Design a protein around this ligand. Sequence first.
Ligand SMILES: *[C@@H]1O[C@H](CO)[C@@H](O[C@@H]2O[C@H](CO)[C@@H](O[C@@H]3O[C@H](CO[C@H]4O[C@H](CO)[C@@H](O)[C@H](O[C@H]5O[C@H](CO)[C@@H](O)[C@H](O)[C@@H]5O)[C@@H]4O)[C@@H](O)[C@H](O[C@H]4O[C@H](CO)[C@@H](O)[C@H](O)[C@@H]4O)[C@@H]3O)[C@H](O)[C@H]2NC(C)=O)[C@H](O)[C@H]1NC(C)=O
Ligand SMILES: *[C@@H]1O[C@H](CO)[C@@H](O[C@@H]2O[C@H](CO)[C@@H](O[C@@H]3O[C@H](CO[C@H]4O[C@H](CO)[C@@H](O)[C@H](O[C@H]5O[C@H](CO)[C@@H](O)[C@H](O)[C@@H]5O)[C@@H]4O)[C@@H](O)[C@H](O[C@H]4O[C@H](CO)[C@@H](O)[C@H](O)[C@@H]4O)[C@@H]3O)[C@H](O)[C@H]2NC(C)=O)[C@H](O)[C@H]1NC(C)=O
Ligand SMILES: [Cl-]
Lengths: 301, 302
Amino acid sequence: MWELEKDVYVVEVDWTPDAPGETVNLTCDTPEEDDITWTSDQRHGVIGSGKTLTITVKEFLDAGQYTCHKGGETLSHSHLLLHKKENGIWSTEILKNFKNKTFLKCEAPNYSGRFTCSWLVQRNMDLKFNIKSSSSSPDSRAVTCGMASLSAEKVTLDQRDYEKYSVSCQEDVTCPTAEETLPIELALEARQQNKYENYSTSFFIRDIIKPDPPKNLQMKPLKNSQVEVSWEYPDSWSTPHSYFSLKFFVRIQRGCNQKGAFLVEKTSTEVQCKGGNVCVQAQDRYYNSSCSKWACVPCRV
Amino acid sequence: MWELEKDVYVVEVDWTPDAPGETVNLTCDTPEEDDITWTSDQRHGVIGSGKTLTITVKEFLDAGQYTCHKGGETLSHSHLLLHKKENGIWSTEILKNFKNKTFLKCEAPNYSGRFTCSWLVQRNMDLKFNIKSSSSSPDSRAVTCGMASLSAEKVTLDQRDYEKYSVSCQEDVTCPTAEETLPIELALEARQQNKYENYSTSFFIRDIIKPDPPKNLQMKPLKNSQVEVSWEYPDSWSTPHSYFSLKFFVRIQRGCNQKGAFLVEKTSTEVQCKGGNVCVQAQDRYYNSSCSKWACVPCKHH
Ligand SMILES: *[C@@H]1O[C@H](CO)[C@@H](O[C@@H]2O[C@H](CO)[C@@H](O[C@@H]3O[C@H](CO[C@H]4O[C@H](CO)[C@@H](O)[C@H](O[C@H]5O[C@H](CO)[C@@H](O)[C@H](O)[C@@H]5O)[C@@H]4O)[C@@H](O)[C@H](O[C@H]4O[C@H](CO)[C@@H](O)[C@H](O)[C@@H]4O)[C@@H]3O)[C@H](O)[C@H]2NC(C)=O)[C@H](O)[C@H]1NC(C)=O
Ligand SMILES: *[C@@H]1O[C@H](CO)[C@@H](O[C@@H]2O[C@H](CO)[C@@H](O[C@@H]3O[C@H](CO[C@H]4O[C@H](CO)[C@@H](O)[C@H](O[C@H]5O[C@H](CO)[C@@H](O)[C@H](O)[C@@H]5O)[C@@H]4O)[C@@H](O)[C@H](O[C@H]4O[C@H](CO)[C@@H](O)[C@H](O)[C@@H]4O)[C@@H]3O)[C@H](O)[C@H]2NC(C)=O)[C@H](O)[C@H]1NC(C)=O
Ligand SMILES: [Cl-]
């Protein structure tokens, strides 16, 4: 057993059929020692007595809020969370993993240090999240995360729509241009009713980069079946652009889709369409990170 | 007098003819107090006695290793180095200054933070060098230098060729784009026998930059007395090249010389030669730092 916060404890439990439950002592926060009575918010009536209550916690009915009493007045209460362990593996049942079998997915629009991480939930009910820097060493990368919020966007995997959550974070001290020598290690604590689980992830900001689509994609014809297309770097992207260079792929219509797109490092090109869309996306010139969303415009005069 | 390291002390001395030497007390590192005697590695026999030896240090014979003894066994020893001061000036006799009358010359091939400093020596014998960050304040630039090594190259000044030393250094913390707001202040300690001197220098890495010569200098003709010459930035140079841009000068034949060289910011040009060499050197586009070495290459029927 271990303390999560004031008067909230987590109990690790082996979830095999014939497992011996953990015996946990819960003492009352009062100077008195007589006429002490205990109750649970999962059971009817008095379930114990004595200043210290000793119980065997195996099932989830053995969890919850245990309340003290003396002479009809309440005294204190302690909360029990369960951390399931089955076949040697810690449970991961509150969150739904993405197609790539990861649970936490983070992406950053630039190298400033700000980024967001997101996850999916199997059932959006009675949830409590909290995310922070897992490693707390001096040579760790300090991060200041916000509070988790339910997002309007709903990811659809298999034939099910999962609600997604998200949280924005900022790296404390930064030098965008500097090379990253060690990763950002994060940890999400997840609760659902009286179930406790936790998810961890490590990453370099360079690997999670995904620029925003190029802005001001304008049109200008040239001759029969030819048109010059121009654009400019997005406002979100890191500055100066001479250092944080970008490359672009250009495809035609009728992550990184490289089926029939041609590379252009400059911010303009000449191409033939005369019917259909001319779409262009961006990527960091020097590192193979995630590409941007497509920015499309028709091919009409 | 002041301590350089454990049991090694430096004595500042005015080297005018009739100068009063500095009196220095040397105590023994032992709990005993009787039968204590002193010797020197510059003098024969016992030169003193008592737990504390008091001597007048003026000449170099008064320097060296002073050893402590009791009952035939050695106890401890202290080393004395001399720092000469003549006409108010601290001596600079171990090192030979360059043509520009400086002693330390540093150069960097890129903005990484790595660089090297070099110096010359008048006589390569019984030398000990050590270089470090002179200022040790919080707002100073921290540097981690290596060990000084004798170089194969020998600079030739006047009518004599002098042996050269060099040491590579790295600036602890770096930010590629960042502007340098204060310089890198270094200090070299030099010893030769029992003589101590020290040399200092301050610089911004941007000022010591000297790129390496441009690589893959290929040729491709055009017409009678016309030919296109192309090259590419050197591998040592900082990246990305869109930020760390370079300039190039192109001269003809038959450390920026630029006597008859013409500027080209792009990595190629068309020029007339039809006989001779076409040489090209590089420089940082935006700062007037040192230029690179030259990269040279030579130049019927219907
Ligand atoms: C993700 O999820 C995992 C899985 O739960 C988290 O891992 C757990 O973290 C907690 C807190 O960091 C760990 O608890 C600590 O455990 C140590 C060591 O405990 C063992 O050794 C002790 C020796 O004194 C012993 O007392 C312990 O006994 C208890 O537990 C057993 C059952 O295991 C039970 O039978 C006993 O009756 C006891 O109740 C155990 O054998 C312990 O020393 C710590 O306590 C000290 O330090 C704290 C901090 O100051 C202090 O407050 C205490 O008073 C005490 O001085 C503390 O209990 C837990 O062990 C981890 N789980 C595992 C499997 O190792 C992980 O933290 C989560 N990560 C994130 C990022 O959220
Ligand atoms: C390059 O070369 C120059 C030239 O030598 C170096 O300059 C010298 O650096 C050293 C170390 O930083 C300096 O020594 C210190 O001196 C101070 C002040 O000393 C004066 O005032 C003292 C007042 O208490 C007094 O005691 C001193 O007296 C001694 O010297 C006189 C002769 O000058 C002699 O007659 C006496 O008998 C004494 O022996 C002197 O008047 C001193 O306070 C320092 O000591 C304290 O701090 C150290 C550090 O913690 C500590 O260990 C000590 O116990 C003590 O608490 C220390 O001795 C020296 O003064 C500098 N030279 C000059 C001319 O100023 C320079 O450092 C070199 N640079 C590089 C980068 O290598
Ligand atoms: Cl210099």
